[PDB]
Every structure is written in C-alpha cells, then in structure tokens.
Ligand binder design. Structure first.
Ligand SMILES: Nc1ncnc2c1ncn2[C@@H]1O[C@H](COP(=O)(O)OP(=O)(O)CP(=O)(O)O)[C@@H](O)[C@H]1O
Ligand SMILES: Nc1ncnc2c1ncn2[C@@H]1O[C@H](COP(=O)(O)OP(=O)(O)CP(=O)(O)O)[C@@H](O)[C@H]1O
Ligand code: BEF
Ligand code: BEF
Ligand SMILES: [Mg+2]
Ligand SMILES: [Mg+2]
Ligand SMILES: [Mg+2]
Ligand SMILES: [Mg+2]
Lengths: 376, 379
C-alpha cells in the first residue's frame, strides 16, 4: 500500500512530530506505525512486519532496553535505531553494543536522516541483489529458448532442402500431364513417377525424423523427487515462491528414462512460475506452489502420480481445451514457444503414463503426471 | 585424499608417537616436520598444509607464537595443539585462543577423533562442491536433451502437415496411372497434384517463417551492455569448469545495430566451445586452463567494427577439420554433448548483422574466435 513501513515507539507526540518532520523533508515514502507500550510494540512487529524500528528509550510503562531485547528475539533482521533525548553520546555508543543498528540523539535530530537513509539504502541493496540474480536467470532462459528455436529452424531448413528436389519433380511431371505435352501412355508413366516421388518424400522425412530422435530402465521414485527438489529450490527463491510438499512415495520404481521424467516435471514448474509471476509481480503471501507425489490406482493398476499445483492465474476455460497442442502459447512469442505441454504429453505417453490437469480459473491449476510402477 | 599435515614438534620420539596413531588409522597423509619459526612459516606459505599439529614447547619456538602466526597467514587451516607441557585446565584455554582442538600427549588416543573431525569437515566442503557440480551438470544435460527434443517435435509437425497433401498427390497420381479417368479428368487431376505440391511448399514456408523470422528489427545497442551481460552469464560457467578468465581489453561507448540477444548467442556459443575444448585438454585443475576475453574496435575495408574475441588455450583445431567447421551439423563431440549447430548458427547470425565470424588456431596450443559487427555511426 505504502512502500516503507516505519514502527515508532515513542510517548511524546511532540518528539514524534519532530522525528517525522525530518523524514517528510526527505520525501521518504513510509507508513507510520506509532506505539507507546509493550503490547502495541509486540503486536505491531508480528502483524504489521515493519521494515524499520525507531525507538525512544523512556516511555511511561515501557523502556528501550526491553524493546531492544524483544526486537532481537522477534525480528532479528529488522534495523533498530534508538532516537532518545534521555542521555548523552557516551551512553548512546553502548546501546550499539547492545545491538541497536544506529543511535540518534533528540538534541541532534539532524543525525536522524543519515541513519534512516543508510538503513533504507542497505534494504534496497539487498532487494537489488536478488533482482540482479532474477534478471540474470531470465536472460539465461531467453538465450536457451532462442538456441532451441534456431535448432528447430535448422531442422525445418534441412527437411525442406531434402524434400524440395522430389517436390520439384512432382510439379514438373504434373505440369507435363496438365500441359498435355505427353501422350496418354507417357502420362501414366509420369503419374507412376509422381507416386514414387511422393513415397520418396515420405521416406526422406522418416529418415530425418529417425535421425532427430535410450531404453527404459528401473529408476527409484525417490531419486526423481530429490533431483526435482534440488533443481527448483533456487527457482522458487529467485521468484520468491513459497513451495509446499504434501506427500512423497519413494521406494517404488518405474521403468523410465529418468531425464525425460524430470523434463516433464520441470516444464510444469516453469508453467507454474510464469503463472505466479503474472498474478503476483511483487512479494505476496499467496504466491505459493504445492508439489506432491503419491501412489494412485487406476483400472486395478498402480501409478506414481507427480502433482504440481500453483495458485496463479489458473487456465481460462476458453483456452483449456487447447493447451496440449504443439506451439500453443498465450505468452508473447519472445517468452513462450508453446512446446512445454505438448512435449510433456508425448513423453508421458511413451512411458505408458498419462498427463492430465484440473484447474479453477483465478484459484489454482494442478498438473499431474502418472507413470505405472514397475513391479518385477 | 593425499592430505598434507604440518607437525611443529621438537621431540622426534613424540613425533613418532603422534604419527603412529595416525598410521594405525590408515590415514593417507604427507608429513611435513618443522622445529623452528622459519621452517614453520615457510611450510605454511610454500606447502599449504591441510592440518597443523603443534607442540607448545620447542627450543627457540613456542606454540603461542605458532598460533598467532597461523591466525595471520592461514586463518582457515585447522590447528590442533598436541603438547605434553600442561594439564587439561590449561588446554581448554588454548581453544579460546583459537586452537581447533587440544590433545594431551599422555592421552594420545584423543588425537584420532580430533583429526577425524577436522578431516570430515574438509571432506564435507568437498562433498558440497561435488553436489553443486553434479546438479549443474544435470541441468545442462537436461537442457541439451530438451534442445534435441525440440528438433524432433519440429520434424514431427512438418511431417503431419505435409502428409495430408502427400496422400492426395498419391491418390490423384494413382487414378491417372490406372487409366480409370478420361484424358480430361487426368489433366484436371494433374492440376490438383500441382496445387497440392504448391500447398506442401506453403506449409513448409509458414513453418520455416515461425522458426527463423520471429527475430525482430535491428536496433542500436551499446557495446558495454553486451559485455556486462556476457560477463554475468559466463562467470558461473568458468567457476564450474575451474577456468581462469582474463579480459585483455574492452571498448564500450560504441554502438552497433544488432539483435542483442543474438549477439550474446554467438558469444555464448563460442564460450561453450572454449569450455569443451578446455575440459578435453585439462580434465583436472591446471594453471594453463585459461581463457582470454577481449573486445576492441577494428578497422576493416575502411569500416570500423566492434570485435568480440574469445581465446581459449584448450585442444587446438586440427588442420584437416579447420576447413570444414561452421558447416551445419558438423561436430566432433558425441551426440550427448554436441549437435554441431553452434558455429553454423553463429556464422549465419554474424552475416545477417553485416559482420563476420572468423578464427585462428595453432594445434595443441590455443584457439581464438572473433566476431566482428559493424559500428553504428551515421556520421
Ligand atoms: N500453470 C499454468 N498456469 C497458467 N497457464 C498455464 C499453466 N501451464 C500452462 N498454461 C497455459 O498453457 C499454455 C501452453 O504452455 P506450454 O508449456 O505448452 O508452452 P509455453 O507457452 O508455456 C512456453 P514453453 O513451451 O517453453 O513451456 C501456456 O502458454 C499458458 O497459457
Ligand atoms: N574452441 C574450439 N576448440 C576446439 N575445437 C573447436 C572449438 N570451437 C569449435 N571447435 C570444433 O568445431 C566443431 C563445431 O562446433 P559447434 O559449436 O558448431 O557444434 P558443436 O560440436 O560445438 C555442438 P553445439 O552445436 O551444441 O554447440 C566442434 O564440435 C569442435 O570439433
Ligand atoms: F523518552 Be526518550 F528517551 F527521549
Ligand atoms: F614440548 Be610440548 F609442548 F609437549
Ligand atoms: Mg519518552
Ligand atoms: Mg510452458
Ligand atoms: Mg616440545
Ligand atoms: Mg558448440
């Protein structure tokens, strides 16, 4: 609502006005929270979560020694600055040793602004560091999508080049028949050649598709979950996503290409992060993701179900039937290739599994991959 | 691991007692023995021991002075006192002075747990690096696999959009070949064959335009933004591969008409080739596993160009293949680690920018690739 949140523990309305006047001269955008006792101070820290505490030493019923001791217990990372008129500088330095972040004397109120600015500058710097890491990650991901598109482009080019020669032959033979440049008997021969060139195009593509494409082996389900956790923890941290796990079922193995199963799961996670960042551009308590594994039984067969539930935008009903189609994306093409869900569905079927989803618009989306357990 | 243990001890008899306890444990260590301050000081600097075991009372030298020096020169090296000169009440105090552990000579059985804990802490640090390296390798393996998967999906989609007209061509051709149609229907069917062949060409053109035309107009970009982004992306690459990366020159304040993302793709492609060449030549840590990254302004044919240069000292490029690199799908790496597309895409991108991509290499010594892009200057 308001950028900074400042907690003032102060009993003098006159001194509060003096302190605030110095901050307002700087056009600092802060939300003031004023408290004069231990209950208000204790409640305001927990419920309001201030980014900075400014405390008086002497309040009726409350003291800055107790306030500092409470702050070190409840909000250790929050900067705490004393601003008091009850002692000199000799006494004030000692308070820093007690773990105050800074100390401002009321008779030297000009010192308040540098103390506040340093604390705010340090807070911004911490935010700036996380942001630079997020931007670096996004740039790395854009380059990776671009390298993927170039390889697709090279494959489209090579297949077009090997096909155009027989395609030309088809057009010349058809043109000779259509032009009437051939007797009835040559037209049958040319029509035979057209069939052979059409069969050639189908074979060239088959040899190419086989060139562009390991055996399944038993893999422990737990090995997959540890790898998925290990890969996505940093993604959630960079995106400030809260990640919850509800259940696991290791000690069951599946016949899979482990790398391809992890590829499915990673694609769903990427869809969840994009959905979450679109709904919650800043930090929000509802920017959460649920990751679960479970054993499911279907048609008297047991399956390992991997589930990824995000609380982002959900999938609008008009597009929900069209989401596994190749190249379908609602993101601007610069950020979305539309290949994630279609590749994951292809891989899932190759493993004898299924990929399905449930979503309620504006609430959640849950994608789940089921793969049959290998029982020897 | 071949640990290196520095022993500051003046009694050869007590040294044999200490070493005998470690040798019973089959601890693989290299002993370094010193009895004075000069030998102790040199051994820390020159040999870089992984553990220091020190006596308190050596003639001409003392463990208080040893601790103070160790804290100045090798603060992170574990330091365990092993002395016969005092009791446990005095020994506990030595830990407060920053000894890692204290072993009494009369209780030499306590030496092994102190050493094992110190070695385990070193191993744990090595284990952490290994787990991070393995995680990074798996992420790169998954990304390479996804690139191969995308190529397969594009090959599949073009086959699906083409097969419908291919079926029609084959059916129409079959009716003509059987003679089941008069001469006028055969000409009409031949026209349909022509129309379906043109359709296949159009389907392919629309697919190729999505794969090679969603690129963007050229815009002026400042050279320095490209260099900072390249630095930020490759810092982690060099750290994971234990590559020493040096920059010889930069030339910001010059701009080029480019697709910034495509320029970074060239440079990143050259970097990946350097890392692979370097990893093939130096599988372990080596001081010559170095990379030189430079930018400069170059003049060619009375035109000024921004040159980005990447020089690795890895596996030189053999003369027989030097003439063939940059060809589409040419790779000497296995399929698990190479598609052969990096240099061919980079040469295309360089030409689309009015630039060139070139290289110099001496076999067994170094390779230098350099990308030239024209400076944007209306004047
Ligand atoms: N968790 C999620 N939340 C909201 N929408 C989602 C979603 N997962 C998928 N979608 C929708 O389905 C579409 C299909 O996405 P898909 O993964 O197939 O391609 P993509 O647009 O995500 C780029 P990429 O192929 O690189 O993953 C998305 O563009 C989006 O509109
Ligand atoms: N710095 C370098 N040192 C040694 N050989 C190099 C090299 N740069 C390129 N090469 C050689 O040229 C080949 C072409 O590399 P290119 O990048 O085009 O495809 P690639 O083999 O590296 C797999 P990818 O297409 O995924 O990058 C390499 O496989 C390698 O044999
Ligand atoms: F009451 Be306070 F210490 F200014
Ligand atoms: F001489 Be030592 F300190 F055992
Ligand atoms: Mg007061
Ligand atoms: Mg996706
Ligand atoms: Mg001695
Ligand atoms: Mg390469």
């Amino acid at each position: 609502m308001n950028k900074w949140k400042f907690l003032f523990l102060e009993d003098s309305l006159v001194d509060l006005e003096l302190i605030q006047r110095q901050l307002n001269r700087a056009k600092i955008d802060y939300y003031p929270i004023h408290v004069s006792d231990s209950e208000g101070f204790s409640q305001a820290i927990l419920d309001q979560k201030p980014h900075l505490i400014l405390s008086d030493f002497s309040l009726p019923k409350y003291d800055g020694f107790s306030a500092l001791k409470l702050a070190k217990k409840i909000c250790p990372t929050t900067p705490f600055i004393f601003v008091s008129g009850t002692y000199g500088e000799e006494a004030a330095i000692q308070t820093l040793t007690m773990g105050a972040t800074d100390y401002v004397l009321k008779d030297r109120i000009e010192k308040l602004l540098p103390a506040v600015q340093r604390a705010l500058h340090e807070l911004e710097d911490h935010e700036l560091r996380i942001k630079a890491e997020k931007e670096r990650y996004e740039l790395e991901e854009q380059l990776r999508q671009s390298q993927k598109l170039e390889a697709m482009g090279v494959m489209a080019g090579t297949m077009a080049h090997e096909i155009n020669n027989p395609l030309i032959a088809i057009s010349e033979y058809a043109a000779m028949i259509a032009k009437g440049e051939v007797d009835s008997e040559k037209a049958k021969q040319l029509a035979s050649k057209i069939r052979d060139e059409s069969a050639r195009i189908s074979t060239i593509m088959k040899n190419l598709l086989r060139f562009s494409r390991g055996s399944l082996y038993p893999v422990e389900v737990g090995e997959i979950l540890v790898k998925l956790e290990s890969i996505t923890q940093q993604i959630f941290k960079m995106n400030r996503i809260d990640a919850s796990w509800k259940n696991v079922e290791p000690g069951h193995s599946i016949q899979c290409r482990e790398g391809q199963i992890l590829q499915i799961l990673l694609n769903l996670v990427n869809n969840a992060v994009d959905s979450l960042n679109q709904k919650y551009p800043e930090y929000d308590t509802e920017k959460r993701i649920i990751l679960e594994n479970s054993i499911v039984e279907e048609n008297h067969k047991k399956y390992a179900e991997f589930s990824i539930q995000d609380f982002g935008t959900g999938i609008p009903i008009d597009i929900q039937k069209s989401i596994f189609k190749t190249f379908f994306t609602t993101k601007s093409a610069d950020k979305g290739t539309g290949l994630g869900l279609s590749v994951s569905l292809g891989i899932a079927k190759e493993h004898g599994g299924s990929l399905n989803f449930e979503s309620e618009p504006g609430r959640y989306t849950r994608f789940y991959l089921r793969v049959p357990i290998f029982d020897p």
